[PDB]
């Protein structure tokens, strides 16, 4: 009776401390990058920000008239439907995947708000091969307690910062089922994003697209 | 709307070239991703620097230093035609280098049915002296006594009275 | 259990359930209240206003 209430109360405070620690980390990382860029500019030096280990990929072309070589990759990316968004560990083994499914998907660097809103609204966990909504921290705790992930904030951190267990967290998240964008795509959507279309890599504009889709 | 971007990049450092030269271009693009893509295409086509072996060290948007002063810009361009080989120089009078680039793209697409890819910007300079100003219409805009009637003056359907369509 | 899905962003109560930290967040902080140091190298300005 009292033991479970005390343990859960202490667990609640522990999550609060972790979330406070994570929030400070994001603020410090953003502030320190700004300070580094400011000092480089003052000295005349050029500062290169680090590569983004995280990418968010949205499938923009349907299941019709797609070559088998490209189809298998979206099967491996769990992009089995149009307007489906997933997190991918951006590395040298993924850059080549996304370069050959350039005409069929779009991707970019998601900021903290994009990841935070996606898991809050579209966050569904794969529990016993079922799509269970992440409606409470105990759902995540029983499914990711081995990797010391206890709450939604812990899951957001493990996804945003690409921690050691990013593969387990990304595989736990059922692919986000995003709606059609509010306001629509561009006039011609299947042209490359650079050439005025809406396909391929788009860097920090994946956020502006995702907010439409949420 | 286009945005002027200063783009600086270099190849990845290696024992052969521990200090590669930093190449900087001033090119116009709607956003940063397009600007970097156009930079890499230009670098490959000029210095044969591979996009794969390179990286981007600095990107900075450029605002017009004096956006409230009327200026005349001369632009060199290498347009691609059926033969894919042309080079022209055009003059535009406006208050922003971005505006002159915007006007040039609209003009070339209107006359020669060009595209963003068929057009490559070669050089943009600000011609400040009426002596170096060449085009007749630009000169007749820099005349001291410029004055002319306003042309093309032009729901609530079913107007009850005839339009004045004059002063 | 969980007959209906409630969006934490639009539900202040569900947000409290999921994230026991939103009760103390302090979103807006005033940090530009000291002498704003205009930090721009002179050589950088020349390179910026080049050509």
């Amino acid at each position: 009776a009292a033991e479970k209430k005390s343990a859960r109360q202490k667990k609640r405070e522990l999550i609060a401390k972790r979330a406070e620690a994570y929030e400070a980390e994001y603020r410090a990382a953003e502030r320190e990058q700004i300070e580094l860029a400011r000092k480089a500019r003052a000295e005349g030096n050029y500062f290169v920000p680090h590569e983004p280990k995280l990418i968010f990929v949205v499938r923009i072309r349907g299941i019709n008239n797609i070559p088998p070589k490209a189809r298998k990759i979206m099967q491996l990316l769990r992009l089995l439907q149009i307007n489906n968004g997933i997190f991918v560990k951006f590395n040298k083994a993924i850059k080549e995947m996304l370069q050959v499914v350039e005409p069929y998907v779009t991707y970019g660097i998601p900021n903290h708000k994009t990841v935070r809103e996606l898991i809050y609204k579209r966050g569904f966990g794969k529990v016993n091969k079922q799509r269970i909504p992440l409606s409470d921290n105990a759902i995540i705790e029983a499914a990711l307690g081995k990797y010391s992930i206890l709450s939604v904030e812990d899951l957001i951190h493990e996804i945003y910062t690409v921690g050691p267990n990013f593969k387990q967290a990304a595989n736990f998240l059922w692919p986000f089922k995003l709606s059609s964008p509010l306001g629509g795509w561009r006039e011609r959507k299947f042209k490359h994003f650079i050439e005025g279309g809406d396909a391929g890599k788009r860097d920090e504009h994946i956020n502006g697209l995702v907010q439409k889709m949420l | 709307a286009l945005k002027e971007y200063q783009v600086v990049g270099r190849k990845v450092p290696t024992e052969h070239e521990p200090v590669p030269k930093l190449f900087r271009m001033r090119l116009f693009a709607p956003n940063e991703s397009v600007a970097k893509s156009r930079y890499w295409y230009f670098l490959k086509m000029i210095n044969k620097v591979k996009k794969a072996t390179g990286e981007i060290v600095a990107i900075n948007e450029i605002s017009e230093p004096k956006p409230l002063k009327a200026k005349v810009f001369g632009i060199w361009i290498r347009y691609d035609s059926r033969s894919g080989t042309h080079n022209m120089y055009k003059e535009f009078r406006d208050t922003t280098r971005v505006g002159a680039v915007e006007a040039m793209y609209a003009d070339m697409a209107a006359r020669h049915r060009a595209r963003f890819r068929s057009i490559r910007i070669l050089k943009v300079v600000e011609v400040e002296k009426k002596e170096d100003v060449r085009r007749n219409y630009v000169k007749q805009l820099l005349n001291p006594h410029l004055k002319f009637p306003l042309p093309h003056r032009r729901k609530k359907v079913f107007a009850p009275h005839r339009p004045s369509t004059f002063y | 259990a969980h007959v209906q899905k409630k969006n934490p962003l639009k539900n202040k109560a569900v947000l409290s359930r999921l994230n026991p930290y939103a009760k103390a967040y302090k979103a807006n902080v005033k940090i530009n209240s000291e002498k704003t140091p205009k930090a721009a190298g002179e050589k950088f300005l020349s390179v910026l206003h080049e050509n």
């Binding site: 030096n45 290169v48 | 200090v19 930093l22 271009m25 | -």
Partner: peptide
Amino acid sequence: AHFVSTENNEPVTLHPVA
């Protein structure tokens, strides 16, 4: 991230060639 120095690495401006 990492830092790169421009000391004795002044940037050369480049513009395409006709």
